[PDB]
Amino acid sequence: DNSYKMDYPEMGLCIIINNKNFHKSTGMTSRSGTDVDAANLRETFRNLKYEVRNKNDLTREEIVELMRDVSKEDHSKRSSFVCVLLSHGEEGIIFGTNGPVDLKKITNFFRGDRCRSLTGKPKLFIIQACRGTELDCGIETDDDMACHKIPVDADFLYAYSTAPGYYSWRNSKDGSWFIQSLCAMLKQYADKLEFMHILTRVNRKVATEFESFSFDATFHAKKQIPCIVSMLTKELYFYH
Amino acid sequence: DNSYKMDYPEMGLCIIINNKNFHKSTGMTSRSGTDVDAANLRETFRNLKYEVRNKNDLTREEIVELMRDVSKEDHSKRSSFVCVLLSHGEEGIIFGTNGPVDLKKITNFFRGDRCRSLTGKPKLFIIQACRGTELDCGIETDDDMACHKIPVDADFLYAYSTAPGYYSWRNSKDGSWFIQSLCAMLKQYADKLEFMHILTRVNRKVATEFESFSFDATFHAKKQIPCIVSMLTKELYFYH
Ligand SMILES: *CC(=O)[C@H](CC(=O)O)NC(=O)c1ccc(CNS(=O)(=O)c2ccc(O)c(C(=O)O)c2)cc1
Ligand SMILES: *CC(=O)[C@H](CC(=O)O)NC(=O)c1ccc(CNS(=O)(=O)c2ccc(O)c(C(=O)O)c2)cc1
Numbered sequence: 001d002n003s004y005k006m007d008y009p010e011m012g013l014c015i016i017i018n019n020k021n022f023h024k025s026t027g028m029t030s031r032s033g034t035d036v037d038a039a040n041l042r043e044t045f046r047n048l049k050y051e052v053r054n055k056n057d058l059t060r061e062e063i064v065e066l067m068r069d070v071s072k073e074d075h076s077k078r079s080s081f082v083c084v085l086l087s088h089g090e091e092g093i094i095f096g097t098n099g100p101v102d103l104k105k106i107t108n109f110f111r112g113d114r115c116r117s118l119t120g121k122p123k124l125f126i127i128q129a130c131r132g133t134e135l136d137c138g139i140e141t142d143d144d145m146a147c148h149k150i151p152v153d154a155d156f157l158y159a160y161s162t163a164p165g166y167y168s169w170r171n172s173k174d175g176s177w178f179i180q181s182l183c184a185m186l187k188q189y190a191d192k193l194e195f196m197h198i199l200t201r202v203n204r205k206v207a208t209e210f211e212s213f214s215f216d217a218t219f220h221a222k223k224q225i226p227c228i229v230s231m232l233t234k235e236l237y238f239y240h
Numbered sequence: 241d242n243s244y245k246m247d248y249p250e251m252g253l254c255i256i257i258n259n260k261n262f263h264k265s266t267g268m269t270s271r272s273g274t275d276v277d278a279a280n281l282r283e284t285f286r287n288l289k290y291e292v293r294n295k296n297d298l299t300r301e302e303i304v305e306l307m308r309d310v311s312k313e314d315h316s317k318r319s320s321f322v323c324v325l326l327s328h329g330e331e332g333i334i335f336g337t338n339g340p341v342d343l344k345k346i347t348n349f350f351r352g353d354r355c356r357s358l359t360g361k362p363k364l365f366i367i368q369a370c371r372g373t374e375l376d377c378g379i380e381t382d383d384d385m386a387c388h389k390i391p392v393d394a395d396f397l398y399a400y401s402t403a404p405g406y407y408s409w410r411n412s413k414d415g416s417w418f419i420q421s422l423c424a425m426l427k428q429y430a431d432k433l434e435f436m437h438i439l440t441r442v443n444r445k446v447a448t449e450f451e452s453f454s455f456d457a458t459f460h461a462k463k464q465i466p467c468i469v470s471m472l473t474k475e476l477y478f479y480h
Contacts, residue, residue: 002441104405112378119379136392137392138353138388138389138390139356140388140389141359141360143453148381148451149379149451150378150448151447151463152376153376163391163393194437196440199470200436200473200474203471204473207391207473208388209385224391225390225393225473227471228468230436230440230468231403231443231465232443235437235440
């Protein structure tokens with residue numbers, strides 16, 4: 001029908017890569033507050049019946065190896081796959097503790113031709129990381145081959161914390177604006193709303209309720225809009 | 241609320257930029273079939289009650305001047321804004337008849353801080369153009385500042401014909417896979433489904449029903465998935 005089959009015996013894995021401390025050589029600062037996000041996500045996805053695996057402070061090599069190994073598991077009995085990345089980033093890039101890795105390298109292991117037991121199933125990548133350094137100042141308000149094949153990039157969804165090219169906000173006490181919002185809206189709406197509609201509420205929450213406050217005028221009164229990228233081919237409900 | 245107000249006196253403008261013939265220096269071939277796309281879009285959006293303006297074979301300077309001018313119109317009585325680009329492209333780039341221009345230069349005129357009469361209203365950019373040269377081989381199956389402000393990048397939706405880095409297919413006789421599918425799903429579902437759900441059906445239609453056939457193996461048996469990029473903050477229904 002019009003929605004993904006989510007009544008396989010297992011909902012699937014939820015891999016959370018939580019990079020907090022970075023090698024001195026990289027110059028990257030410790031991501032205070034990321035443990036709050038990681039715990040929030042773990043509970044949130046546990047409640048949606050995902051098999052959560054938390055991984056901390058992985059090098060880029062370990063990230064790639066982890067994703068390769070996970071993609072070689074047999075996911076036949078699982079409805080979907082979720083991977084959450086919490087780290088520093090730039091456009092198209094997430095950081096290991098020792099340096100950058102392209103997101104495409106991580107996601108390619110899950111292409112429809114490379115992970116066959118996830119073919120036709122939604123593969124969700126949730127990314128809390130910057131996509132560049134820009135700050136949003138805001139504004140005051142007939143040959144029939146039907147289904148012989150599917151594209152290898154079909155059935156991926158990326159839930160980015162921020163717009164292309166932009167900074168992504170996090171605070172030590174409450175975690176990141178995006179993950180805070182995402183978890184809240186999943187807690188409230190996962191048993192009732194289709195996923196793109198949940199993510200749209202997340203966009204509104206981040207866009208409307210958060211604004212930076214800083215003694216540094218260059219860092220003050222800033223705003224953020226998350227960015228949903230869907231190559232999904234069906235509606236996704238976490239319930240059946 | 242949860243959905244955009246779509247009962248202003250006018251649905252809004254639908255600008256269709258149809259680039260078919262290109263200057264010698266571009267090395268770009270004539271985009272046979274694009275007029276089928278242009279006409280299908282004109283009729284589809286007319287039926288949704290948008291004020292359609294078709295523009296043909298614009299240089300990149302004319303595109304930028306056109307967008308600047310349109311963004312300076314008073315859109316107070318309009319619910320939304322639609323811009324469709326039909327041309328050659330690369331990632332982040334659309335071609336004027338005389339060469340490339342960054343999409344960001346076109347969309348920037350419509351930011352929340354730069355086009356005030358569209359602040360808070362959905363701005364949709366529908367893009368039929370390649371995003372690179374890859375071909376998809378497929379696989380057989382405390383502080384209350386709550387508004388206040390919104391991000392300047394809020395309330396944009398991009399409906400890209402294809403995934404990042406990939407080719408985008410066009411048929412010399414029926415038009416492009418994406419635009420044919422988009423017009424068909426709007427015709428069938430605009431009176432019944434929220435817009436992300438209509439685009440999801442477009443994704444499925446393109447992914448499942450189309451597969452290239454070519455005497456050249458390089459171009460044979462290829463697939464395509466469109467790519468929805470939402471920075472919207474509410475649900476969008478074309479009926480009220
Ligand atoms: C650029 C990047 O990849 C990372 C992404 C990430 O770590 O999630 N972003 C940052 O490194 C980053 C670092 C620091 C801050 C600001 N944090 S703060 O100083 O605690 C702060 C100041 C003012 C203010 O209003 C807030 C707030 O949350 O509202 C936080 C942001 C991003
Ligand atoms: C690269 C780029 O930006 C543009 C985008 C665009 O024009 O919309 N793409 C192309 O330039 C382009 C050119 C030619 C074709 C193939 N067209 S065809 O020769 O009519 C054809 C051959 C085989 C085949 O199977 C089809 C089909 O529709 O199935 C069409 C594609 C893109």
